[PDB]
Design a binder for these strands. Structure first.
Ligand SMILES: [Mg+2]
Ligand SMILES: [Mg+2]
Ligand SMILES: [Mg+2]
Ligand SMILES: [Mg+2]
Ligand SMILES: [Mg+2]
Ligand SMILES: [Mg+2]
Ligand SMILES: [Mg+2]
Ligand SMILES: [Mg+2]
Ligand SMILES: [Mg+2]
Ligand SMILES: [Mg+2]
Ligand SMILES: [Mg+2]
Ligand SMILES: [Mg+2]
Ligand SMILES: [Mg+2]
Ligand SMILES: [Mg+2]
Ligand SMILES: [Mg+2]
Ligand SMILES: [Mg+2]
Ligand SMILES: [Mg+2]
Ligand SMILES: [Mg+2]
Ligand SMILES: [Mg+2]
Ligand SMILES: [Mg+2]
Ligand SMILES: [Mg+2]
Ligand SMILES: [Mg+2]
Ligand SMILES: [Mg+2]
Ligand SMILES: [Mg+2]
Ligand SMILES: [Mg+2]
Ligand SMILES: [Mg+2]
Ligand SMILES: [Mg+2]
Ligand SMILES: [Mg+2]
Ligand SMILES: [Mg+2]
Ligand SMILES: [Mg+2]
Ligand SMILES: [Mg+2]
Ligand SMILES: [Mg+2]
Ligand SMILES: [Mg+2]
Ligand SMILES: [Mg+2]
Ligand SMILES: [Mg+2]
Ligand SMILES: [Mg+2]
Ligand SMILES: [Mg+2]
Ligand SMILES: [Mg+2]
Ligand SMILES: [Mg+2]
Ligand SMILES: [Mg+2]
Ligand SMILES: [Zn+2]
Lengths: 158, 122, 59, 134, 86, 50, 135, 52
RNA sequence: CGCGACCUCAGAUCAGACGUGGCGACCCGCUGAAUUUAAGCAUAUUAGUCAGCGGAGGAGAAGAAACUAACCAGGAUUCCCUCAGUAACGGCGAGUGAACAGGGAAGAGCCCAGCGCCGAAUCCCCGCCCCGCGGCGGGGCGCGGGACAUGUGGCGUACGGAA
RNA sequence: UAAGGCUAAAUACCGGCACGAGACCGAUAGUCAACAAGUACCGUAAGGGAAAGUUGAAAAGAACUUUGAAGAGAGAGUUCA
RNA sequence: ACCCACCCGACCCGUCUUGAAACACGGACCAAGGAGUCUAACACGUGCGCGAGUCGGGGGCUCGCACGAAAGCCGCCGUGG
RNA sequence: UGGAGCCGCCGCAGGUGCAGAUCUUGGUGGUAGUAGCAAAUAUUCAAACGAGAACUUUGAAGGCCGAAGUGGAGAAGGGUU
RNA sequence: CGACUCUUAGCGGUGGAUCACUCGGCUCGUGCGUCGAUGAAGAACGCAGCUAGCUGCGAGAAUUAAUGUGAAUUGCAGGACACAUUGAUCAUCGACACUUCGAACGCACUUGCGGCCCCGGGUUCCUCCCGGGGCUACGCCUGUCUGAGCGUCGCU
């Protein structure tokens, strides 16, 4: 029964909720586990960025977010076509590619081509064998860095 | 007095049997003697003879089964006994050669578009 | 005797003959309330039971 | 402290480990120090005590400078019986009184081949650590 | 009569020893158990008797195969080999 | 009953073997907590798995 | 359809649940068809089914099955996914094309129930007091 | 129950304020002596040392 | 009144394989209450919850848009934080109740049928040799059987593809 | 771009094997269960289901004498007790 | 504070009840056990920090955690509330 | 008396204080050496053993069941009686 | 004073509170994440020199082999062993073994009845008889052999 003034309030504890309470005593143990697993994955992908692949710049949807810009899922095909990277290869050099992205405006396209161009400049493709063929960079830019890149690769700053 | 595994390994098959028989006889008499009092001195042996009997029988089965899996090592179909028991499910895994069969389409993919070792910022 | 519970009279007869080089008239088994199949074994009249009894140890 | 995160430091766990210990493990638990004399000679602090070592009892009632030969090792009872370490029961019969191995000192070892190789292994590890420390 | 005098004529039995579960619950006329359902291919268990469930779970018995499987696994399901001999 | 099956007879036999009282040398063992058998079944009171 | 198996009527309860006649099973007949083909041939691994006709009384179906342990399937790489033991009893778990449809999962606004794995899982997620450490 | 609110979370400035307060009174011989520490013969109370 | 193809069907203690039961904390598919709340009760609620049946795996399920949106647009699934006790449902009472966006954990994408081209270029089992053999495989050689044109294999699948 | 299909990862885990810890309980508590417990015992059956830890550092657990048919005592002795 | 004596006073507690010494119920006696808890949401009061802001989660970076499943830090410091 | 751990102060935390619940588990009284050991006719003498005899055994006498039996054998059930 | 009753204290009983211990629980976390026709889980019955229960094992039955260890096990016996030797005793466990029921499999649940191949006594393949051994569940797939049909054809 209500007594003199207060929010006529509806709690949702009518089902058997104590049967499905989910505690968080994991979380520290979890946080570590992720972190180990993270450091392992770095070490496996030895000079490759820990991050992942490079990802496009992309505007959010809706009037609300609109003004901001994130990393997207992957670079469109037009953006790869214009940059001149064969889509099947782009995956092999650490360039995210989605193929479901349309491309409406040319301002978002040329920006994302520029991204890939810049990436290709500051990328150090190792040759397949220690014996060096084409494409593969010099042993100078190799000895001076077989270095991983900490954090997201070429980060987007709005 | 002591019958060891050590020596029995080399011995001939007929020779192993006679030895087992002679222990089986010796076991009988002690069992007889346990009924009629006998003596603590006898009622030790009964445990000893039992284990020496086992030591004999064991050597025989090891020899018979070693020879057997020599005889089939090579043949495709072999007795279930001699086939390798791991775990029901584990005997239905894919074959070790069968699970690394690439489709020609997948092989071609690995040939044309291999993942490359690369780094960034230079 | 006390005998293994799985045994037929035929088997006992054959065992008694084999072990003690003897020869049987008839075997006559029962089961003790304890679990151990007992066996009364009549030896053929050429043989004396007390003589074999002395051979096997018992008396 | 102990930092190894697979050891235990848990009364109940250590005691259970102890009392329900298996013979070969008890051998190690039932160890006893060498006399300073032997400590000098072999380069070994202590040794697993055995059926017929010569031994002094250091503490208790039987604490004394006599050197009694070991009589038996009752690993179930965590104890060793020693030559003249005994007590007359009600009816005159002598009874070998138990002494715990660690409250005893080995003056003379019973050296077999294996005991010889053990002492060679312990002395070598001791001198490796002194070389590492230096 | 309903009571003590009628306890008098309990001369004959319903159940006997079931040969799967071992319980004295094999109903002779029905020729089924009512404990494991014997003739029934699958074992009888019900989720309401959690106490009953626990009374013959796995752990309970010998686990004579299953206890050496656990050991076998531990060290790695190695087969047909020995340790280096002397 | 005097008309037994073999199944039942064997069952009874084991039950008959289980009844015996403790061997007194057991009392003298090292870590002994056992003083009496406590699983002793008298036919006149308590009536079998049957 | 599916009449409610209760003696006479006698679905004792609140008269919401009094229904016995006009009510209808969740899975399709085609799924039931597969499930039965699966039941019967335990070794065989149900792949998929199709329709071949319908009377008033019956429907007919044709369930494609596969030996997971016939070398021609085992060694063909493109099929050897069915030989994996997660794909035991697809039809029983609601995993063939047919029995997928009852589960009520597809992308987009017309679903939401089944916005974890499945119907059950979303409910599970939605009715967990997540009780955090610090709150 | 397990889901008793065990952990207790504190505003960050407040945490810092406490840690400043403790530092500030790690000076003050009185507060150090009162906390029991026999600091009678020590040469200087915010006691700082060489970095060997 | 034969013999021979095939089709559809039987029988074999035929050769060689698999399936059956268990466990069930977690998982997938069905099935499915009533105490209870509403200060009575029938819709509602309890609840797609307990019990019931089925089937799994080390996880399962899901998953590469017949999606979101309506923006200057995002771009598989799962998970967390938020959205939000909100939009909505409801004897509009009791009560119930999501999603997108946004930020993170992770991050990976692919293959058929078809349409077409390629002497079925494909597969299984036999038998002889060399290696290898405690996850039955490689290589060779057999007018040695069979599957298959009522369609096997290579190329190829919407991000276009072929010539 | 539906009416065919495969796919690791972050996710779950009061069952299992093997460990680690605790501002928990300390034998009417904590698991039914610290012990020969799902035991004894009950019930035709489904099922129900206990009680029960502690001599001492060491058994050194009371030789011997004596009263009594004996259980029981009286002295003696062991033990720091 | 142990016992006894004497003068005066003085019905048995608990409880429901307008009213209990009640011919109202519960209570032979002693030991141990035994009932306003925790979570969530709201409101007001009070204490502290910061203040047109505040915030910490969730996540991440720093360790094999002995003490740590803590402590610290974050253009994430603010997606967001 | 006992024989191995325990307390003061400042803070924090709670499964924190019992006379009652026809409360729970265990124990103990008064009642009380009380009720009670009364269905179905019956016992007596001597001896033996024996620490010890109303009750055992043997002998003698007196009695009962009175072959629809208090006799002689099974079924079921018990499970070593 | 007498007996009895009441009260207090001493000592003794009854009873097992309290306190002190704890090889047990309860909770949180970590890693791994493995049963089965090659017979699972579960049940039964067995097995020790003296052993009933718990445990441990399976007719090789408180265990065999192997490897590691290196003198015990021990309630009492007895023993072994040369503990300068594969060597007691534990641990591990890769070899061997694993009675009967049980999905449970020749058919039945009496523990009853069988069939078919081979072996030893029995014969001198004479079938009997006895004993031993190996097969003999259902469903299903790939092939194989034997077939069936006024099913569709061809040739005769
Ligand atoms: Mg990331
Ligand atoms: Mg292809
Ligand atoms: Mg009776
Ligand atoms: Mg309703
Ligand atoms: Mg549809
Ligand atoms: Mg199953
Ligand atoms: Mg109501
Ligand atoms: Mg009401
Ligand atoms: Mg009502
Ligand atoms: Mg509902
Ligand atoms: Mg359920
Ligand atoms: Mg999956
Ligand atoms: Mg799709
Ligand atoms: Mg989405
Ligand atoms: Mg809000
Ligand atoms: Mg609802
Ligand atoms: Mg094609
Ligand atoms: Mg799938
Ligand atoms: Mg207790
Ligand atoms: Mg107690
Ligand atoms: Mg308790
Ligand atoms: Mg106590
Ligand atoms: Mg006590
Ligand atoms: Mg006590
Ligand atoms: Mg004392
Ligand atoms: Mg009232
Ligand atoms: Mg009134
Ligand atoms: Mg009153
Ligand atoms: Mg009145
Ligand atoms: Mg009342
Ligand atoms: Mg009363
Ligand atoms: Mg109290
Ligand atoms: Mg306030
Ligand atoms: Mg003490
Ligand atoms: Mg507490
Ligand atoms: Mg009280
Ligand atoms: Mg009287
Ligand atoms: Mg008679
Ligand atoms: Mg008194
Ligand atoms: Mg008690
Ligand atoms: Zn049963």
């Amino acid at each position: 029964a209500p007594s003199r003034n207060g929010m006529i309030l509806k709690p949702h504890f009518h089902k058997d909720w104590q049967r499905r309470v989910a505690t968080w005593f994991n979380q520290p143990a979890r946080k570590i586990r992720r972190r180990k697993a993270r450091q392992a994955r770095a070490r496996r992908i030895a000079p490759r960025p820990a991050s992942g692949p490079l990802r496009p710049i992309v505007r959010c949807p809706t009037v609300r977010y609109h003004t901001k810009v994130r990393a997207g899922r992957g670079f469109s095909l037009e953006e790869l076509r214009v940059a001149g990277i064969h889509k099947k290869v782009a995956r092999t050099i650490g360039i995210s590619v989605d193929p479901r992205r349309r491309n409406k405006s040319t301002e978002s396209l040329q920006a994302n081509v520029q991204r890939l161009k810049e990436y290709r400049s500051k990328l150090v493709l190792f040759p397949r064998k220690p014996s060096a063929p084409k494409k593969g960079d010099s042993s100078a830019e190799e000895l001076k860095l077989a270095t991983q890149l900490t954090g997201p690769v070429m980060p987007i700053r709005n | 007095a002591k019958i060891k595994a050590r020596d029995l390994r080399g011995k001939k098959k007929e020779e192993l049997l006679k030895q087992l028989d002679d222990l089986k006889v010796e076991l009988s008499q002690l069992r007889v003697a346990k009924v009629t009092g006998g003596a603590a001195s006898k009622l030790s042996k009964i445990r000893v003879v039992r284990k020496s009997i086992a030591r004999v029988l064991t050597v025989i089965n090891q020899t018979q089964k070693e020879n057997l899996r020599k005889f089939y090592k090579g043949k495709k179909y072999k007795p279930l006994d001699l086939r390798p028991k791991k775990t029901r499910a584990m005997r239905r895994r894919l074959n070790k050669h069968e699970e690394s069969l690439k489709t020609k389409k997948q092989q071609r993919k690995e040939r044309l578009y291999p993942l490359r070792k690369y780094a960034v910022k230079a | 005797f006390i005998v293994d519970v799985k045994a037929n009279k035929h088997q006992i007869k054959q065992a008694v003959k084999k072990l003690y080089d003897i020869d049987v008239a008839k075997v006559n088994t029962l089961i003790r309330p304890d679990g151990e199949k007992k066996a009364y074994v009549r030896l053929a009249p050429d043989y004396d039971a007390l003589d074999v009894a002395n051979k096997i140890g018992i008396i | 402290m102990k930092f190894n995160p697979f050891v235990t430091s848990d009364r109940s766990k250590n005691r259970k480990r102890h009392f329900n210990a298996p013979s070969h493990i008890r051998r190690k638990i039932m160890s006893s120090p060498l006399s300073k004399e032997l400590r000098q000679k072999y380069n070994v602090r202590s040794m697993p005590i055995r059926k017929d070592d010569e031994v002094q009892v250091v503490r208790g009632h039987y604490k004394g400078q006599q050197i009694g030969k070991v009589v038996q090792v009752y690993r179930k009872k965590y104890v060793i019986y020693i030559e003249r370490v005994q007590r007359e029961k009600a009816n005159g019969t002598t009874v070998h009184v138990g002494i715990h191995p660690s409250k005893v000192v080995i003056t003379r070892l019973k050296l077999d081949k294996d005991r010889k190789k053990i002492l060679e292994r312990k002395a070598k590890s001791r001198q490796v650590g002194k070389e590492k420390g230096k | 009569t309903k009571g003590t005098s009628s306890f008098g004529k309990r001369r004959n039995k319903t159940h006997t020893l079931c040969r799967r579960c071992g319980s004295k619950a094999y109903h002779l006329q029905k020729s089924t158990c009512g404990k494991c359902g014997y003739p029934a291919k699958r074992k009888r268990k019900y989720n309401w008797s959690a106490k009953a469930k626990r009374r013959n779970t796995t752990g309970t018995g010998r686990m004579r195969h299953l206890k050496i499987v656990y050991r076998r696994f531990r060290h790695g399901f190695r087969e047909g080999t020995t340790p280096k001999p002397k | 009953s005097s008309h037994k099956t073999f199944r039942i007879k064997r069952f009874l036999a084991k039950k008959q073997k289980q009844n015996r009282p403790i061997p007194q040398w057991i009392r003298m063992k090292t870590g002994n907590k056992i003083r009496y058998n406590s699983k002793r079944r008298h036919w006149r009171r308590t009536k079998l798995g049957l | 359809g599916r009449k409610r198996p209760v003696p006479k009527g006698a679905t004792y309860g609140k008269p919401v649940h009094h229904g016995v006649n006009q009510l209808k099973f969740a899975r399709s007949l085609q799924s039931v068809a597969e499930e039965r083909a699966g039941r019967h041939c335990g070794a065989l691994r149900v792949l998929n089914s199709y329709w071949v006709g319908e009377d008033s009384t019956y429907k007919f179906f044709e369930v494609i099955l596969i030996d997971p342990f016939h070398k021609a399937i085992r060694r063909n790489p493109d099929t050897q996914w069915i030989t994996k033991p997660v794909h035991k009893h697809r039809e029983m778990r609601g995993l063939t094309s047919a029995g997928r449809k009852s589960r009520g999962l597809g992308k987009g606004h017309k679903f939401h129930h089944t916005i974890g794995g499945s119907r059950r899982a979303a409910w599970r997620r939605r009715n967990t007091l997540q009780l955090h450490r610090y709150r | 129950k397990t889901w008793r609110r065990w952990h207790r979370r504190v505003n960050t400035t407040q945490k810092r304020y406490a840690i400043c307060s403790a530092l500030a009174a790690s000076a003050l011989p009185a507060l150090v002596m009162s906390k029991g520490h026999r600091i009678e013969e020590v040469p200087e109370l915010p006691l700082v040392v060489e970095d060997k």
